[PDB]
Design a protein around this nucleic acid. Structure first.
Ligand SMILES: [Zn+2]
Ligand SMILES: [Zn+2]
Length: 54
DNA sequence: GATATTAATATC
DNA sequence: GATATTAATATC
């Protein structure tokens, strides 16, 4: 029953609405300790993290 | 919240 | 065109 303010998207988790707000604003709180790439979700940062590790 | 999934994008 | 990466989001 969560909704969004900048656009009209309903969300499931409240954390989901928070990350999607980050999708509007540009807050990418997860910093790659190797390269400087920053990410919205921790999972996306782990995704990228796999890249240099191999 | 973590993870998996799809669509979109950068790299070649 | 193929492939790797990313961005956003459904699913658990
Ligand atoms: Zn929104
Ligand atoms: Zn990195």
């Amino acid at each position: 029953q969560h909704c969004c303010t900048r656009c009209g998207k309903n969300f499931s988790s409240a954390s989901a609405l928070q990350i999607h707000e980050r999708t509007h604003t540009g807050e990418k709180p997860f910093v790659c300790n190797i390269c400087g790439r920053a990410f919205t979700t921790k999972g996306n940062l782990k995704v990228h993290y796999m890249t240099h590790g191999a």
